[PDB]
Design a protein around this nucleic acid. Structure first.
Ligand SMILES: Nc1ncnc2c1ncn2[C@H]1C[C@H](O)[C@@H](COP(=O)(O)OP(=O)(O)OP(=O)(O)O)O1
Ligand SMILES: [Ca+2]
Ligand SMILES: [Mg+2]
Length: 430
DNA sequence: ATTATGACGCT
DNA sequence: AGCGTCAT
């Protein structure tokens, strides 16, 4: 009852760029705007691999993780922009730099957690308290929420999507008690007003559109964000959770899309998030462990406590290349040449990072895959990173991996390497 | 031959 | 530390 926490203490948003690498390429090349188009890396094998797809192209069934030759079968007029290649490998610098543009704008409104190259969580609790005082018990006009959906509404006693959006928004606003400054529903609504302003700023200042979710925690904000993509934002209230979760496949919730989520389904014989409410906390802990069980018990009631971490910058800087099929590295000189290529890109990115962000990486992680294994990594080894020098780093990497060579002859490499990976970690202020 | 990343958990 | 899981 009165002592039952409801997880309504925070306002959290998740902002996610729409079709992000495609938008980056469309800004650069106006010929690609408002077209079925996709971003592809490499080209020789099956036309290259698609890694981002415009919404126009998605209408034809084009997806990421699709080969371009196959995408062209669904969409003959599909336009393609290629990822830059430098030192023999895909180079994602243009997209990392575009990401920084967006992250810096978001950071003006609140402290953010960089969750991926194109999305960030925002803890808006304090900003909402501030705006609430400015409002002075003035109602929130629908005009302040021009791209906002209220999940679950409209209900009860219609043809158009925009019309339905407004219907729901009006029901929501009509029901708001604005004179309670601690009403969670009101707090979320003010949060949504701020996120409209944030999203407007991102589009004005970069040209990029995005979607967003507003709720009381990260998992609900993430889920909310996806409900109305692209170029829209969605408010998921605490009250909307029972209906939302009653038909929500467990795999849709962040962290449950893999083996754990499959085990929840199998072990408990359920399909939807809402069905979890019928188990005790101890029951869930018994199957999924203490931490997961407690997390699931709260999460299925819309409650989660994971904080928005104040972290705008990536904690690691890495460089990776696959050498599939027949291109696998079977000679020592091959291995050394590619380690150098990776190390040269790494040095470039590290030197820029040190200048921009006043920090230095202190640990180099070297990872390889050997033909045969279908684990992503076959072996991971760390060594000290004491200087930002590509030849030193590539020589050090070679030293820590050279023992994996089963070949009795040392010019040859067996089994051939199907992946190399260099990663700089353990930053210290500088 | 679903590539190139990046964070966090376990032991 | 090195490995695994999950994610974009
Ligand atoms: N598996 C991947 N491999 C390589 N790059 C990826 C992968 N997934 C995502 N990316 C890149 C390309 C995407 O434009 C970008 C952001 O990912 P993501 O948010 O999942 O999709 P998206 O921004 O392209 O479309 P959406 O509008 O659905 O968010 O990160
Ligand atoms: Ca996105
Ligand atoms: Mg994303």
């Amino acid at each position: 009852g009165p002592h039952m926490a409801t997880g309504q203490d925070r306002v959290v948003a998740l902002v996610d760029m729409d079709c992000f690498f495609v938008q980056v390429e469309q800004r650069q090349n106006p010929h690609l705007r408002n077209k079925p188009c996709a971003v592809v890396q490499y080209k020789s094998w099956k036309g290259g691999g698609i890694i981002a797809v415009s919404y126009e192209a998605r209408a034809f069934g084009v997806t990421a993780s699709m080969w371009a030759d196959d995408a062209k079968k669904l969409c003959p007029d599909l336009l393609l922009a290629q990822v830059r290649e430098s030192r023999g490998k895909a180079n994602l610098t243009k997209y990392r730099e575009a990401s920084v543009e967006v992250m810096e704008i978001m950071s003006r409104f609140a402290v953010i957690e960089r969750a991926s190259i194109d999305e960030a969580y925002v803890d808006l609790t304090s900003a909402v308290q501030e705006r609430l005082q400015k409002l002075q018990g003035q109602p929130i006009s629908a005009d302040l929420l021009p791209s906002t959906y209220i999940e679950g509404l409209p209900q009860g006693p219609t043809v158009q999507k925009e019309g339905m959006r407004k219907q729901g928004l009006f029901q929501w606003l009509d029901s708001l008690q604005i004179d309670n400054l601690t009403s969670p529903d009101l707090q979320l609504t003010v949060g949504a007003v701020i996120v409209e302003e944030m999203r407007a700023a991102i589009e004005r200042e970069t040209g990029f559109q995005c979607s967003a979710g507003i709720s009381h925690n990260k998992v609900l904000a993430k889920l909310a964000c996806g409900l109305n993509k692209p170029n829209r934002q969605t408010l998921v209230s605490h009250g909307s959770v029972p209906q939302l979760f009653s038909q929500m496949p467990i795999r849709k919730i962040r962290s449950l899309g893999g083996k754990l989520g499959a085990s929840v389904i199998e072990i408990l014989g359920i399909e939807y998030m809402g069905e979890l409410t019928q188990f005790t906390e101890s029951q869930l802990q018994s199957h999924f462990g203490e931490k997961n069980g407690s997390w699931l018990y709260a999460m299925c009631r819309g409650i989660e406590h994971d904080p928005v971490k104040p972290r705008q910058l990536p904690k690691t800087i890495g460089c990776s290349k696959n050498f599939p099929g027949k291109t696998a590295l079977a000679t020592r000189e091959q291995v050394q040449w590619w380690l150098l290529q990776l190390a040269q890109e790494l040095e470039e990115r590290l030197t820029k990072d040190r200048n921009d962000n006043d920090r230095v990486a202190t640990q180099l992680v070297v990872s390889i895959r050997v033909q045969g294994d279908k684990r992503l990594s076959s072996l991971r080894r760390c060594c000290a990173l004491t200087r930002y020098d590509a030849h030193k780093m590539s020589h050090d990497a070679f030293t820590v991996i050279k023992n994996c060579n089963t070949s009795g002859i040392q010019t040859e490499w067996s089994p051939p390497l199907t992946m190399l990976f260099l990663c700089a970690t353990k930053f210290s202020a500088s």
